[PDB]
From a paper:
To address these knowledge gaps, we present the high-resolution cryo-EM structure of the human MON1A−CCZ1−RAB7AN125I (HsMCR7N125I) complex at 2.85 Å resolution, capturing RAB7A in a nucleotide-free state stabilized through unprecedented interactions with CCZ1. Due to the RAB7AN125I (the nucleotide-free mutant) exhibiting poor solubility when expressed alone, we co-expressed HsRAB7AN125I with HsMC1 in Sf9 insect cells via dual baculovirus infection, enabling efficient complex assembly. The final structure demonstrated that HsMC1 adopts a heterodimeric architecture, with MON1A and CCZ1 each comprising three tandem LDs (LD1−LD3). Inter-subunit interactions within HsMC1 are mediated by β-sheet fusion between LD1 and LD3 domains of MON1A and CCZ1, forming two continuous β-sheets that stabilize the heterodimer. Consistent with evolutionary conservation of GEF−RAB interfaces, the primary RAB7A binding sites are located within the LD1 domain of HsMC1, with MON1A contributing predominantly and CCZ1 playing a minor role. High-resolution density maps resolved key residues at the HsMC1−RAB7A interfaces, involving RAB7A’s nucleotide-sensitive regions: the Switch I (N30−D44), Switch II (A65−G80), and the P-loop (G15−T22). MON1A engages RAB7A through polar contacts between its E260/E290 side chains and RAB7A R79, as well as K263 and RAB7A D82. CCZ1 contributes complementary interactions via hydrogen bonds between E41/R60 and RAB7A R69, Q70 and RAB7A Q36, and E38 and RAB7A Q67/S17. Comparative analysis of GTP-bound and HsMC1-bound RAB7A revealed large-scale rearrangements in nucleotide-sensitive regions: Switch I (19.7 Å), Switch II (6.3 Å), and P-loop (10.7 Å). Our data support a two-step nucleotide displacement model: MON1A-mediated Switch I restructure weakens GDP binding, while CCZ1-driven P-loop rearrangement disrupts Mg2+ coordination, enabling passive nucleotide exchange.
The functionally conserved MON1−CCZ1 (MC1) complex serves as a guanine nucleotide exchange factor (GEF) for the RAB GTPase RAB7A and is indispensable for directing RAB7A recruitment to autophagosome or lysosomal membranes. Among RAB family members, RAB7A serves as a master regulator of late endosomal maturation, lysosomal biogenesis, and autophagosome−lysosome fusion. The spatiotemporal activation of RAB GTPases is precisely controlled by guanine nucleotide exchange factors (GEFs) that catalyze GDP−GTP exchange, and GTPase-activating proteins (GAPs) that accelerate GTP hydrolysis. In metazoans, the MON1−CCZ1 (MC1) complexes have evolved through the incorporation of an additional non-tri-longin domain (non-TLD) subunit, RMC1 (Regulator of MON1−CCZ1) in humans and Bulli in Drosophila, suggesting functional specialization in higher eukaryotes.
Residue numbers in the entry:
A (entry chain A): 16 to 257, 278 to 286, 296 to 365, 372 to 396, 401 to 476
B (entry chain B): 241 to 652
C (entry chain C): 7 to 126, 135 to 154, 160 to 178
Write the structure that this text describes.
């Protein structure tokens, strides 16, 4: 009876080597450190190890510092979201607890299971998740010093790291795309007309977004900001709550988000309204503070109109609705479009978990080339796994055709590409 | 200095060998004494995690990888800007470690570095750097190291058995192996009863013979250790070239240092046996064309292949032709083969068929329990053409099998 | 000829003073606040032989104590920098050497080469050095003389 221990978040810390230049103030480098109950000397030792790793890799490539450090027991992922500000995530290696001849628990560390891209993307997502709600590190610094920066870091990451689950992280976490909601042109035009009507009648509403069935439909924001906003809406905001029009966020306190950080650095109150699953997000300038009567005014104006629209999508979606032997993950980089027939709502994998490592390694080998590419593989578990990278689209197909040759696999892949991607 | 440092940083694979105390032992590019501080940093990084009940494996950065392997009393570091994974780079570093062992014996290495850890291993390894550079170049271009298998020189079955019998007839008590070599290719191997030859020792012997020209001046008698066979003892290899104009290298491994006249006999005896039977003309003819073209197979859109037999531990491959005429293209093709082999031979995720369709080439890998076959096609080749190539090449290898492989390995 | 030299003391991190004004200023590799050691290179010309010093200027913080057994292995000699403005001179000079001999554990700790560099009474340190098997004492210029004597010793033992 072997025991399997999945990867776990060993530690997470944000530091700045420029702080505390003189001896005895190394503790000032560590802006945030989790777990907090770890001893101070151990904290300084871990931060110093990461600084040493980056400074050593800078002797072979000054422009490109280290992104990862692999050890026997854990893997540590580095990121520098802002100059001199380093985040580090230490993730425990998977463990096999073998029963030896006289029991003798043997703790084997499976050092090759973890996919580096998954946790690197997770770390980048941690930074962007912080920056969506609290802005950049430098802005908080110029506002209120290292003290204010540390309070903001703690207040966000103490509650953010509780919701991080590194056992369920997979290729979809590398992708970081948006699961879009397919639609026809008439309903798209209706959505645009509705969004214009409400954002013009309400005046102060300066940004908008429309999602249905947890899937994004239309986005008035910027791509790299709407990405993180959609992650917040789907994986954090909706699950806590999972005419019929109802306020989902607000009453009057509205979360303050920061978008277009690289260009304009706009702070907006975030408002979310639900009719069925037709989520509408309004974003209002920070100068205007909404009142109880404004949302009451807002409720009346949106009200049945979203409810009328909501009852319209469900009928058309049901009307549009043999078994597809293909199970694929598709990612488009132009629009960050993401589709998946493998992962369902548990979201964790619905296939044999030994094939996700294959799917992650095909992705690992893909990015070394910026051209058309194709890798077709057959596992020892008689499963066919294909991957195609063409004109900034990535397709990963898995098929159960144990009695099939290469020609039949290619024919099935071509049929899928012609049908599901017409 | 600024330009020299910038050129030093741009090398595709730095290899550092250092003691557990930090003192340099070897650097592929640049002097060891100018890199002493960086090797001290390497030891400090190793020890920092060793004192944390951990062990540092590798550091991955965009575009390159640092790989640490600790084979006490040595730390071997590889800073590679290539595609090779950490496992393949660790395998190359282990090949370097076994190359050092082949010169020093593990017993002597551990003893000298446990009596004192302030010792400078460069003192014992002085003059043996060029062996390490030659071994690294062979990894860069020879498919044998990636395959972990020997290549057989294509030779007629009658001639191959004649030369094998001639090798067997010339034997001594102390001999363990009898190897006939042609440009890092096997011609005839005669081994002792129940004394297998690991591929790693054979590759180390390839590198040893191909690193120096002193073996071409006559008879050689040097102590060499076979780390995968017996890491605590020294063998003694008699290395000779049969004729001055040929590339035939005869290696006779023995357990006795004093026995040199006997091994020189067993060399002369085999030479005159070969001359008496008249097979030396056929061997010279085979040496004049020591490779075969892809066009012999007859399937178009094929450029190169590797075929290893799991049962025999031997592989065959045609001559590397256009477009891989240059060294860069040969290295790229070998790197593609390395990628295919590593992916298909994952410890936890093994695979049995890989088909890669890149803009520059098509790559195929078929790995079963009996053989592994790696194929290269032009990018214009289709999938059905690839399968037909599989079947035609299988038929052709099963037809030329006697000529391309040693099918009946002899024994004293 | 490459030597591994450990400098005990010098809480300077970046401004090590002695290990910044010694020689070269290239091959810096400053990790005395992250690893606990400074890795420097210094060529020394002694008796028709040119030796190289892989100097390990180790940090003296308390979070780097567990790294002594590792960082001190293979060391050929150790250099002590001793403050002349301390009240515990005789009780803290011996502690450094005792802990070094415990952690490094050379083959002949009794005859291990040591050198004391007075930084910033001389009688006390000189008497301690004489009572410690005649350890050379230099007052710190004078950072060059110690390393040549450091080169002079530890070559006599092995070579």
């Amino acid at each position: 009876q072997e025991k399997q221990f999945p990867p776990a978040l060993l530690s997470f810390f944000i530091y700045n080597p420029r702080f505390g230049p003189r001896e005895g103030q190394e503790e000032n480098k560590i802006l945030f450190y989790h777990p907090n109950e770890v001893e101070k000397n151990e904290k300084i030792r871990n931060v110093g190890l990461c600084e040493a790793i980056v400074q050593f890799t800078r002797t072979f490539s000054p422009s490109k510092p280290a992104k990862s450090l692999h050890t026997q027991k854990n893997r540590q992922f580095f990121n520098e979201p802002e100059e001199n500000f380093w985040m580090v995530m230490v993730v425990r290696n998977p463990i096999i607890e073998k029963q030896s001849k006289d029991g003798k628990p043997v703790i084997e560390y499976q050092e090759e299971e973890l996919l580096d891209k998954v946790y690197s993307s997770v770390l980048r997502q941690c930074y962007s998740m912080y920056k969506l709600f609290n802005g950049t590190f430098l802005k908080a610094m110029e506002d209120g010093g290292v003290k204010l920066l540390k309070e903001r870091l703690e207040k966000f990451f103490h509650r953010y790291l509780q919701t991080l689950h590194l056992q369920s992280c997979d290729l979809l976490d590398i992708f970081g795309g948006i699961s879009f909601f397919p639609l026809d042109k008439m309903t798209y035009l209706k959505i645009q007309s509705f969004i214009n009507r409400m954002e013009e009648s309400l005046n102060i509403v300066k940004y908008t977004a429309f999602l249905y069935n947890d899937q994004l439909i239309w986005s008035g924001l910027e791509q790299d900001d709407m990405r993180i906003l959609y992650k917040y809406l789907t994986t954090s905001l909706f699950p806590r709550h999972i005419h019929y029009g109802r306020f989902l966020t607000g009453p009057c306190r509205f979360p303050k988000i920061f978008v277009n950080t690289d260009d304009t650095y706009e702070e907006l109150h975030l408002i979310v309204y639900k009719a069925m699953s037709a989520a509408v997000c309004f974003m209002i300038d920070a100068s205007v503070h909404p009142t109880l009567d404004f949302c009451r005014r807002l409720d009346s104006i949106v009200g049945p109109q979203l409810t009328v629209l909501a009852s319209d999508i469900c009928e058309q979606f049901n009307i549009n609705k043999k078994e597809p032997q293909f199970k694929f993950i598709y990612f488009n980089h132009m629009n960050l479009a993401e589709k998946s027939t493998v992962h369902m709502r548990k979201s964790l994998t619905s296939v044999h978990p030994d094939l996700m490592k294959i799917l992650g390694d095909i992705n690992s080998d893909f990015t070394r080339v910026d051209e058309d590419e194709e890798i077709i593989v057959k596992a020892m578990s008689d499963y066919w796994v294909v991957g195609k990278k063409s004109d900034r689209r990535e397709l990963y197909v898995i098929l159960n055709q144990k009695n099939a040759n290469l020609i039949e696999v290619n024919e099935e892949v071509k049929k899928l590409c012609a049908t599901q991607f017409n | 200095e600024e330009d020299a440092t910038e050129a030093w940083r741009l090398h595709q694979k730095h290899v550092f060998v250092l003691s557990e105390a930090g003192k340099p032992v070897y650097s592929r590019y640049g002097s060891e004494e100018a890199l002493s501080s960086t090797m001290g940093v390497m030891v400090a990084l190793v020890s920092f995690l060793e004192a944390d009940k951990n062990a540092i494996r590798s550091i991955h950065a965009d575009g390159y990888k640092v790989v640490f392997v600790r084979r006490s009393p040595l730390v071997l570091v590889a800073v590679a800007r290539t595609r090779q994974s950490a496992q393949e780079l660790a395998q190359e570093l282990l090949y370097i470690y076994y190359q050092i062992l082949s010169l020093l014996t593990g017993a002597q290495l551990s003893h000298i570095f446990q009596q004192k850890q302030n010792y400078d291993l460069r003192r014992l390894l002085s003059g043996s750097e060029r062996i390490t550079d030659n071994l690294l170049q062979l990894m860069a271009r020879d498919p044998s190291f990636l395959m972990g298998a020997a290549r057989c020189l294509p030779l007629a079955a009658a001639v191959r058995d004649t030369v094998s019998a001639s090798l067997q007839q010339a034997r001594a008590r102390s001999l363990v192996f009898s190897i006939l070599l042609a440009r890092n290719q096997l011609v005839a191997l005669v081994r002792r009863k129940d004394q297998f030859l690991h591929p790693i020792d054979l590759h180390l012997l390839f590198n040893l013979i191909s690193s120096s020209s002193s073996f071409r001046e006559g008879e050689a008698w040097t102590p060499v250790c076979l780390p995968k066979f017996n890491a605590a003892g020294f063998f003694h290899a008699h290395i000779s070239y049969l004729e001055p104009d040929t590339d035939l290298c005869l290696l006779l491994v023995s357990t006795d240092r004093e026995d040199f006249f006997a091994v020189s006999d067993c060399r002369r005896r085999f030479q005159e046996r070969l001359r008496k039977r008249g097979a030396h003309l056929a061997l010279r003819e085979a040496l004049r064309t020591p490779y075969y073209s892809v066009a012999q197979v007859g399937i178009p859109d094929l450029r190169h292949f590797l075929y290893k037999s799991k049962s025999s531990g031997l592989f065959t491959s045609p001559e590397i032709e256009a477009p891989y005429t240059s060294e860069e293209e040969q290295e790229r093709l070998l790197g593609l083969y390395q990628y295919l082999h590593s992916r298909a031979h994952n410890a936890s995720r093994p695979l049995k068929t890989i088909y890669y369709t890149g803009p520059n080439e098509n790559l195929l890998a078929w790995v079963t329990g009996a053989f592994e076959l790696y194929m290269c096609y032009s990018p214009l080749g289709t999938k059905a053409s690839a399968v037909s190539a599989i079947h035609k090449l299988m038929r052709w290898i099963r037809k030329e099998e006697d000529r391309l492989f040693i099918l009946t390995p002899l024994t004293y | 000829v490459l030597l591994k030299v450990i400098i005990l003391g010098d809480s300077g991190v970046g401004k090590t003073s002695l290990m910044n004004q010694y020689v070269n200023k290239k091959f810096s590799n400053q990790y005395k606040a992250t690893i606990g050691a400074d890795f420097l290179t210094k060529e020394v010309m002694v008796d028709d032989r040119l030796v190289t010093m892989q100097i390990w200027d180790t940090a003296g913080q308390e979070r780097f104590q567990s790294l002594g057994v590792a960082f001190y292995r293979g060391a050929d000699c150790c250099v002590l920098v001793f403050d002349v403005t301390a009240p515990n001179t005789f009780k803290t000079l011996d502690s450094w050497r005792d802990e070094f001999l415990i952690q490094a554990s050379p083959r002949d700790p009794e005859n291990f080469p040591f050198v004391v560099l007075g930084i910033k009474a001389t009688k006390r340190a000189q008497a301690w050095c004489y009572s410690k098997n005649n350890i050379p004492y230099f007052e710190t210029i004078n950072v060059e003389q110690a390393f040549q004597t450091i080169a002079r010793n530890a070559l006599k033992q092995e070579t």
